[PDB]
Amino acid sequence: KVFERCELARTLKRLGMDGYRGISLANWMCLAKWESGYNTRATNYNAGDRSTDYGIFQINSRLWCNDGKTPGAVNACHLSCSALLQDNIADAVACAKRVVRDPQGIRAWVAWRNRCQNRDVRQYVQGCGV
Numbered sequence: 001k002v003f004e005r006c007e008l009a010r011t012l013k014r015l016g017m018d019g020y021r022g023i024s025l026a027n028w029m030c031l032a033k034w035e036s037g038y039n040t041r042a043t044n045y046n047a048g049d050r051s052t053d054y055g056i057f058q059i060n061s062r063l064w065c066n067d068g069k070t071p072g073a074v075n076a077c078h079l080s081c082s083a084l085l086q087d088n089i090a091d092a093v094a095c096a097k098r099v100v101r102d103p104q105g106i107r108a109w110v111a112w113r114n115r116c117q118n119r120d121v122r123q124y125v126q127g128c129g130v
């Protein structure tokens with residue numbers, strides 16, 4: 001499912017993501033835009049370290065979720081990577097919360113550092129109601 005912009009916004013707010021660990025809603029909207037283009041079935045495989053990135057928040061299969069086929073997996077989110085491909089983002093949102101609680105917080109999302117850090121990211125929540 002490819003969420004629509006505000007559709008996603010209301011959803012994440014409803015899910016307690018706004019201001020979570022100080023992180024604004026638009027910031028979560030910025031990283032989602034650049035990580036998955038709001039598509040829950042988005043997956044990207046790194047042939048070098050041999051792990052995959054699943055869904056909307058593109059969560060890595062070596063550290064957080066489990067697909068069974070990834071070398072040296074930790075499964076910190078205690079989830080199956082299939083739970084990160086559901087049209088329902090409730091499971092992806094809780095794990096994403098787990099990621100930000102580790103030492104480096106939101107710096108864990110590359111696209112967030114490359115396209116949102118120190119930028120105005122308000123346009124992602126404008127007209128959304130939130």
Ligand SMILES: *[C@@H]1O[C@H](CO)[C@@H](O[C@@H]2O[C@H](CO)[C@@H](O)[C@H](O)[C@H]2NC(C)=O)[C@H](O)[C@H]1NC(C)=O
Nearest residue numbers: 057058059060061063064099102103104108109
């Ligand atoms: C993206 O992959 C990087 C590694 O390429 C992950 O970063 C590691 O994350 C854990 C926990 O946050 C740290 O102990 C490591 O030191 C991190 N490595 C680096 C180089 O930062 C990162 O968590 C992954 N992000 C997602 C969303 O899956």
